[PDB]
């Protein structure tokens, strides 16, 4: 197995005053106003991003179920994962058709790789 996966901070950072205005969006950006409250970090305001939140190099990039993620298109591509079924799990880039997915599926169970997003575009 793996260590226990700890995010250190699980809440997406929002841009100051994002909600009070639409002409402002939700993608974090800095505050350069030297008067501003969010820049000088007054109590009770939003939390900047800062390096200390950087996660644990051991479990970094790990999806929760414990694997990592690797993004495949055709079967010839997932054959690179014959070795690592214990670390990487592979999922199927969105534009793949419903014709080839089912192929990546069957062959991806034979190899015994975990596909994070099966059930995409496939009924029974």
């Amino acid at each position: 197995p793996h260590p226990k996966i700890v995010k250190k901070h699980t809440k997406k950072f929002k841009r100051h005053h994002s909600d009070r205005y639409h002409r402002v969006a939700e993608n974090w950006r800095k505050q350069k106003g030297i008067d501003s409250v969010v820049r000088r970090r007054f109590r009770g305001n939003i939390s900047q991003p800062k390096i200390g939140y950087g996660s644990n190099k051991k479990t970094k990039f790990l999806s929760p179920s414990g694997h990592k993620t690797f993004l495949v298109a055709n079967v010839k591509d997932l054959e690179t994962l014959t070795m690592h079924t214990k670390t990487y799990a592979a999922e199927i880039a969105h534009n793949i058709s419903a014709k080839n997915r089912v192929v990546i599926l069957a062959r991806a169970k034979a190899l015994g790789i975990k596909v994070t997003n099966p059930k995409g575009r496939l009924a029974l």
């Binding site: 970094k60 990039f61 990592k68 993620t69 690797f70 993004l71 010839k76 591509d77 054959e79 690179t80 994962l81 014959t82 070795m83 690592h84 990487y88 058709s97 419903a98 014709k99 997915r101 089912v102 599926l105 069957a106 169970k109 034979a110 190899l111 015994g112 575009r121 496939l122 009924a123 029974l124």
Partner: protein, 169 residues
Amino acid sequence: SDEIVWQVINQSFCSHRIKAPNGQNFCRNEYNVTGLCTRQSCPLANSKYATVKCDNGKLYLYMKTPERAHTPAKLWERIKLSKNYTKALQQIDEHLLHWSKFFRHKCKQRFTKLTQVMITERRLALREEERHYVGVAPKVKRREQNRERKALVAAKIEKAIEKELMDRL
């Protein structure tokens, strides 16, 4: 000489390399052990190398050396390998002799994995005849929904019921 061919492969691109979202970058070459193009697994800069690979038959150990380096059409030598996992492993660490530890350690593994793969695929060949996957194109959807809606709309569905009941009376 080889270290250069590496460094060229480590700055310019290989035709084949992947760069997964985390920092590490696969090597999709058909012939390699471990599938990560790094100094010691990238078949293009080694000049001495050995892997295991399925033919659709059993698992041929492919080997190369420096001497056929210039004669690619035939460079990889090839060996078959037994159906005795035990005897196999003995064949593998047999042919590899003073080949360094890397290839015995790893080649053995690729054998183990592909064997297991075979066994699975053999199981799955025998299973669950039922409920195949199927896709449905989008306009198939749209068509079905609408035509259905109109189907119901066309049938006022009580007039049938009552008229059938006046019938039964």
